[PDB]
Design goal:
By secondary structure, this protein is low in regular secondary structure. The protein is 0% helix and 7% strand. This is Angiostatin.
Length: 253
C-alpha cells in the first residue's frame, strides 16, 4: 500500500518499521520484549501485520509501534505526510494526480512503452510511485514530469502547485562542514581556489538551473556555498567568466 500518511494516520498501511529514533519495531504478534495491548487476535481490522507502524488506538500523534528496545515500550514513527494537492521542494515526494505537462499535453502512462520507449518501468522502481500517467520526479529533474502522448515531444515538465506551508523537516543544518555539506547553511561565499561565488538567483556570468525558485528547500541564498545536488562538498558557480563552478572549502564541524 501507499507509503505516506494523512491526518493522524488512522488508515496508514505502509511498511515503515523503525521508530522516529531508529529503533526496529517489535512484531505485533510477538510478546517480547513487550506485551501488546493491540494485536490481530483482538484488533483484526487495524492492519497489525509484521512489525509495521500503525495507529490502532486513534492516537492524535499518529502511527507508532511497540519497540524491540526493552527500555522503550512503544514510540511514534516518522512517516512521509502525503503530497496530493501541492508539492514541497522539487516534488521528489509528489503523489498527486496531475497528468498534463506545461504545454498542456496528456501524459503517457509509466507502464506503457508507447509512443516513447523508456526505462522508468514501475516494477523496476517500485518505491517511486510511478502510477498511471501522473507527473512524477523519480530521479532528480527540476520538478515532476512525464513522457507525453505526443510522438513529437518525448517528455516535458509539469506545472505542479507549490505548497505554501512549511516543508518536511529534513533534520539539522550546520554552519560548519559535516559530510558532503548537504546540510550546510553557513555564509561562506568563496571557493577553494579563491573565486567569488555567483549569486544563485543570477544568470551571469553563467546560466544555470540551481535557482531558489527550482530548489526552495536547498536555501540557495545570496551567493553562499551550498551542495544542493549530489556533490562531494559545497560548491558554487563563480563570477569568474572562465570557471563555471568550483568546490568551496568549508571547515568541518
Amino acid at each position: 500500500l501507499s507509503e505516506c500518511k494523512t491526518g493522524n494516520g488512522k488508515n496508514y498501511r505502509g511498511t515503515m518499521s523503525k521508530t522516529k529514533n531508529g529503533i526496529t519495531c517489535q512484531k505485533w504478534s510477538s510478546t517480547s520484549p513487550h506485551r501488546p495491548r493491540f494485536s490481530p487476535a483482538t484488533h483484526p481490522s487495524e492492519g497489525l501485520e509484521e512489525n509495521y507502524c500503525r495507529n490502532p488506538d486513534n492516537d492524535p500523534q499518529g502511527p507508532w509501534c511497540y519497540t524491540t528496545d526493552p527500555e522503550k515500550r512503544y514510540d511514534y514513527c516518522d512517516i512521509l505526510e502525503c503530497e496530493e494537492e501541492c508539492m514541497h521542494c522539487s516534488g521528489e515526494n509528489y503523489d498527486g494526480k496531475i497528468s498534463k505537462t506545461m504545454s498542456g499535453l496528456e501524459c503517457q502512462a509509466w507502464d506503457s512503452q508507447s509512443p516513447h520507449a523508456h526505462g522508468y518501468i514501475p516494477s523496476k522502481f517500485p518505491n517511486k510511485n510511478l502510477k498511471k500517467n501522473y507527473c512524477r520526479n523519480p530521479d532528480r529533474e527540476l520538478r515532476p514530469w512525464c513522457f507525453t502522448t505526443d510522438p513529437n515531444k518525448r517528455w516535458e515538465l509539469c506545472d505542479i502547485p507549490r505548497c505554501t506551508t512549511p516543508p518536511p523537516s529534513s533534520g539539522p543544518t550546520y554552519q560548519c562542514l559535516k559530510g558532503t555539506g548537504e546540510n550546510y547553511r553557513g555564509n561562506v561565499a568563496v571557493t577553494v581556489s579563491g573565486h567569488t561565488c555567483q549569486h544563485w538567483s543570477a544568470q551571469t556570468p553563467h546560466t544555470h538551473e540551481r535557482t531558489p525558485e527550482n530548489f526552495p528547500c536547498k536555501n540557495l541564498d545570496e551567493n553562499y556555498c551550498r551542495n544542493p545536488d549530489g556533490k562531494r562538498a559545497p560548491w558554487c558557480h563563480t563570477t569568474n567568466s572562465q570557471v563555471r563552478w568550483e568546490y568551496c572549502k568549508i571547515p568541518s564541524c
